[PDB]
Amino acid sequence: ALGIKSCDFQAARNNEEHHTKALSSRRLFVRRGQPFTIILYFRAPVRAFLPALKKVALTAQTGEQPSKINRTQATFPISSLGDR
Amino acid sequence: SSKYPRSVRRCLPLWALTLEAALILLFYFFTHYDQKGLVASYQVGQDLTVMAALGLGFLTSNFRRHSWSSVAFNLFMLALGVQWAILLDGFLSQKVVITLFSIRLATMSAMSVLISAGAVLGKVNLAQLVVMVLVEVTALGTLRMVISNIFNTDYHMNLRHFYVFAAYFGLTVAWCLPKPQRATIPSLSAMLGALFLWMFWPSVNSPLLRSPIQRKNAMFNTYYALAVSVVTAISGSSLAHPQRKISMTYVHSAVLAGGVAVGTSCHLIPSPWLAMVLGLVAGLISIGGAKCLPVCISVMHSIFSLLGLLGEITYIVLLVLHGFQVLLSIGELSLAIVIALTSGLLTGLLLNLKIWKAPHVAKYFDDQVFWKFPHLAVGF
Amino acid sequence: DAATSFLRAARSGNLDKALDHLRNGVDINTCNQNGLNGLHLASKEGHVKMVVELLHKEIILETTTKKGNTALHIAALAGQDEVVRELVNYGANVNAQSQKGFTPLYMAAQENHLEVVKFLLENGANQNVATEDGFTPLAVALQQGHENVVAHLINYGTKGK
Amino acid sequence: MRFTFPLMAIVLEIAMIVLFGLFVEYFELYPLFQDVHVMIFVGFGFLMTFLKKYGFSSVGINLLVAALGLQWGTIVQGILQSQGQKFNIGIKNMINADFSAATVLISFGAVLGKTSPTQMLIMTILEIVFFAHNEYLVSEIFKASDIGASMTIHAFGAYFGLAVAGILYRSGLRKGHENEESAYYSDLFAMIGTLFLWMFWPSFNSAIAEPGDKQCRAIVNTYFSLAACVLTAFAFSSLVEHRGKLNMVHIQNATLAGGVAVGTCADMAIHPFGSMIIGSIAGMVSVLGYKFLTPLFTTKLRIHDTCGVHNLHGLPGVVGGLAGIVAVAMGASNTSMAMQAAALGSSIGTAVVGGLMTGLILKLPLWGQPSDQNCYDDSVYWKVPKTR
Ligand SMILES: CC(C)CCC[C@@H](C)[C@H]1CC[C@H]2[C@@H]3CC=C4C[C@@H](O)CC[C@]4(C)[C@H]3CC[C@]12C
Numbered sequence A: 001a002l003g004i005k006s007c008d009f010q011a012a013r014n015n016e017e018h019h020t021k022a023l024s025s026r027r028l029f030v031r032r033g034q035p036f037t038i039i040l041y042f043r044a045p046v047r048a049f050l051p052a053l054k055k056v057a058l059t060a061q062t063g064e065q066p067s068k069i070n071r072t073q074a075t076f077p078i079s080s081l082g083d084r
Numbered sequence B: 001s002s003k004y005p006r007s008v009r010r011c012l013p014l015w016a017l018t019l020e021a022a023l024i025l026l027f028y029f030f031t032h033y034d035q036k037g038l039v040a041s042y043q044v045g046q047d048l049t050v051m052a053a054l055g056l057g058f059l060t061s062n063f064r065r066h067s068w069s070s071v072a073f074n075l076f077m078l079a080l081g082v083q084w085a086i087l088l089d090g091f092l093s094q095k096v097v098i099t100l101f102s103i104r105l106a107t108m109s110a111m112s113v114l115i116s117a118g119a120v121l122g123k124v125n126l127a128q129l130v131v132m133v134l135v136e137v138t139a140l141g142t143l144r145m146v147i148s149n150i151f152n153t154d155y156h157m158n159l160r161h162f163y164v165f166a167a168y169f170g171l172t173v174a175w176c177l178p179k180p181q182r183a184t185i186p187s188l189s190a191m192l193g194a195l196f197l198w199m200f201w202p203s204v205n206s207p208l209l210r211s212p213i214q215r216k217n218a219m220f221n222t223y224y225a226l227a228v229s230v231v232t233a234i235s236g237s238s239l240a241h242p243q244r245k246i247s248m249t250y251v252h253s254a255v256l257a258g259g260v261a262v263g264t265s266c267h268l269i270p271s272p273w274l275a276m277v278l279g280l281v282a283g284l285i286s287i288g289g290a291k292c293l294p295v296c297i298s299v300m301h302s303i304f305s306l307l308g309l310l311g312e313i314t315y316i317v318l319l320v321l322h323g324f325q326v327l328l329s330i331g332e333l334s335l336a337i338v339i340a341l342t343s344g345l346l347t348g349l350l351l352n353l354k355i356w357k358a359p360h361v362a363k364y365f366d367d368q369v370f371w372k373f374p375h376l377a378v379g380f
Numbered sequence C: 001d002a003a004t005s006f007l008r009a010a011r012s013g014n015l016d017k018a019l020d021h022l023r024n025g026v027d028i029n030t031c032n033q034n035g036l037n038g039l040h041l042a043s044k045e046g047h048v049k050m051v052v053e054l055l056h057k058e059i060i061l062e063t064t065t066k067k068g069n070t071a072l073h074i075a076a077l078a079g080q081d082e083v084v085r086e087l088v089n090y091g092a093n094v095n096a097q098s099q100k101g102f103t104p105l106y107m108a109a110q111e112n113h114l115e116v117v118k119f120l121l122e123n124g125a126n127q128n129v130a131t132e133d134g135f136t137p138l139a140v141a142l143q144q145g146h147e148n149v150v151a152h153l154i155n156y157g158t159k160g161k
Numbered sequence D: 001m002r003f004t005f006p007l008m009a010i011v012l013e014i015a016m017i018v019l020f021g022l023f024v025e026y027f028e029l030y031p032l033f034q035d036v037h038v039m040i041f042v043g044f045g046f047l048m049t050f051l052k053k054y055g056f057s058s059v060g061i062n063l064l065v066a067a068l069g070l071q072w073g074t075i076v077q078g079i080l081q082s083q084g085q086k087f088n089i090g091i092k093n094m095i096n097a098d099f100s101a102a103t104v105l106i107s108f109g110a111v112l113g114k115t116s117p118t119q120m121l122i123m124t125i126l127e128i129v130f131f132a133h134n135e136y137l138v139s140e141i142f143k144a145s146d147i148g149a150s151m152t153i154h155a156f157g158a159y160f161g162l163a164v165a166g167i168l169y170r171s172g173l174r175k176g177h178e179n180e181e182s183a184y185y186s187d188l189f190a191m192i193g194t195l196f197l198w199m200f201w202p203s204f205n206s207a208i209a210e211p212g213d214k215q216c217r218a219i220v221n222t223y224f225s226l227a228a229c230v231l232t233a234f235a236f237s238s239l240v241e242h243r244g245k246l247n248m249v250h251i252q253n254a255t256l257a258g259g260v261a262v263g264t265c266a267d268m269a270i271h272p273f274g275s276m277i278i279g280s281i282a283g284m285v286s287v288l289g290y291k292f293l294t295p296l297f298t299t300k301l302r303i304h305d306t307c308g309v310h311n312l313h314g315l316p317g318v319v320g321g322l323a324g325i326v327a328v329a330m331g332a333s334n335t336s337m338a339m340q341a342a343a344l345g346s347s348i349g350t351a352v353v354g355g356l357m358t359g360l361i362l363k364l365p366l367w368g369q370p371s372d373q374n375c376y377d378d379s380v381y382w383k384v385p386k387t388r
């Protein structure tokens, strides 16, 4: 009951905040060490927020062979306890 | 987490009162009572009690701020251990008949835990020590029962393994605890404890001996070995010390070297010179262990462990003079070592449970964790 | 129920549940039967992120418990170095006195929390403030044998903030 | 006068010498005697060294009081058992003299820190007279069983000391005192006396027991009563304190209440589980007394007890007497009910009356009593070193 509909990367506003507006207003260009904001859209309403938050994780990979040893792959949950 | 100790106002009293009530109920259901040498027989157990309480309570009070806990926790441990050892030696050797010999043997079983606890004192609270006492007495009784079943020896005579069992149990439990010092008045009180232990240790080496000449020779050998070990330990402490000074802490543990080394063979040594040689060799080995063991947590318990192993080895050497028995005795030793290590591991993983409210690793060796002191902020 | 769940989440460090409760309308200044709010519990348990988040949502920093202890008092008694640092960084009064006259410096000194003692001294804690017994942090550290705290208190002297 | 104490000491010693020359004439119980000796001189003496500035007075006045006490108790207890005639001295006379010393030391527990050595000599003499008379009454007229002397020693000494301290009440000490405080190493030293008393109490309750089943029962019952008492005292000390902390007063004293409350039933067939029940009840009662009754006695009843000897000796001694009565009820002994009850009542009443008279005598300003500000301080009577 946590199906994703679409994800808005909010390229224009994040690119303005990250001083990458001159690059694009459609592709997300972000500078490391600065927070950027995305919007996650669900297919159906989320009844209970906390168990749904426990069930979701995000992963960022770069390159063709991402690995945790190369720091090319990272897996983090969605929580207020995350390391900013 | 919170370094301020959690309240034990509901854990410690409920735990202790439940233990005491269970002991009372078991004593009612299973224990029973029933001459010329009543006082003489009482004297051996009384010497054991004096050693267990006083010597083993004050000997580990050398800590600048843990002397209260050392002495009082040793008293509590002895009081619990004697009762539980009475019940368990009754259960694993047969209704339980309480004689003075049974109380003496229960005191020996409690002394095993009291020796083991020196490796963990300052890093545990009272409830963890209760768990240690119960599990260690159970393990020692199980070891004696297993030896009696396999090697067809008497259950009470298997209690000669208690030095090495206590040493390895204490080492194994201390190894499982979370990881992290001396004053002058605390070191003097500890000398008092060590002196009482050293003076009455010939009673440790002959409580289980029935023949009067065997007790004669055992006490003589222990007395002379302990004298030689005192001389060797006090004089050789300067060599095994970086600043070439005598260490009170080394002397406290190493004075017992001769008594430990001849404990299993004091009744087999025929002449006092052999006991003196064994005491001298034990003192030299104590010096070497002080000079080497810290290189390769408690150094005094490590040297006690190596001394107990040496005592068992010299038992093996001397028993041949007085090759299948060699194999059987090495097997008994190895079984004792394995059971001590396994039970120490079990106790260590039991003590690491969060429910015991163990002190924070920054609050080790501090009486303020367990005791009331004036002019302190209490609570939140 | 909602306030109790919020306080339990603050004690356990569950910042997501506490933020959910604050979103649903739970008052941030609610306290338990001992007068301890979420800031006090988070300071006790060393939950730095929860402490910072609760400070952002306008919790009253100088709220005392039924014993008169502020969050800084509790963090000093519990020896939470980072929580003490953050509470001071957000303007906690380092010279606050409880009902019996204890200061955060006194609680840090009596518990042999050398880092908290050093930080409090560097932030202008006055070690001449006595309790109702007339005891100073130096006196209680001398009584309890905290030799490092005694040495640091003597060496600092009156260097101030 | 600074010469009152040496004068009284010399005169009392000369009187002891004359009395011994007038009344006194010349081995299996010697180890038990030596255990009782260790109890009397180390256990009581160092048990009292918890006060930070009264350790010299505690141990030294313990030694002086007990040394006078053994001689005077020897003389008085002999002249009663001899009915005014010459008597011989054996090991049992020595054991009973140390018992009289124990009673006087228990009463000294109540007035520790507020009395002079001269007052101590006077109270030693008078209290030994009263104690020996009451003990003769219990042992020969009532013929009650008090082999461990919960009634004749512990309860008697506690209520004698309480009566003396009530007569010697100071208004300026009711709200506490600056010197009435323990130190860290002082409690470490008090643990020595606690441990020696705990270790040797089975010999205390079995020294003059009838050889055979009675002596063995006394030893075993005392041992198991103390074993249960330690656990219950630790548990209740944790229970009554904030956050479950342990109180060193409790661990120092309430751990020995099992040896007091088992004394009457020591040689009786009360079984080890019954002895452990008695020891647990004694430990709980002692801890509760220390926590609640001592402040009520000090503030409301205007009876100040320095070492809390009520909670260690009186209430456990009364519990021991009641346990003796209950043991008589259910066939554990052939002694009468009414004789046990009369022994308890006579012990308590004689202790109170003798303590009243002795305290009235000690209240005369002739013995160098310390001032209110100088209480619990060695420097009033001792040369004190500059450093601890
Ligand atoms: C032995 C104990 C438990 C019971 C008997 C004690 C009685 C007889 C004692 C102890 C308390 C005593 C009182 C305590 C205080 C004072 C104040 C003083 O200015 C005059 C005597 C007076 C009024 C005492 C009279 C006697 C007294 C009532």
Ligand SMILES: CC(C)CCC[C@@H](C)[C@H]1CC[C@H]2[C@@H]3CC=C4C[C@@H](O)CC[C@]4(C)[C@H]3CC[C@]12C
Pocket (backbone or CB within 6 Å): D269, D270, D271, D273, D274, D277, D278, D281, D319, D322, D323, D324, D326, D327, D330, D332
């Ligand atoms: C403190 C006051 C109320 C005295 C009461 C103490 C109670 C708990 C003590 C005192 C006398 C004791 C009893 C004395 C005799 C008997 C019979 C014996 O075969 C077994 C033990 C038993 C059953 C004891 C049990 C405990 C006992 C009842």
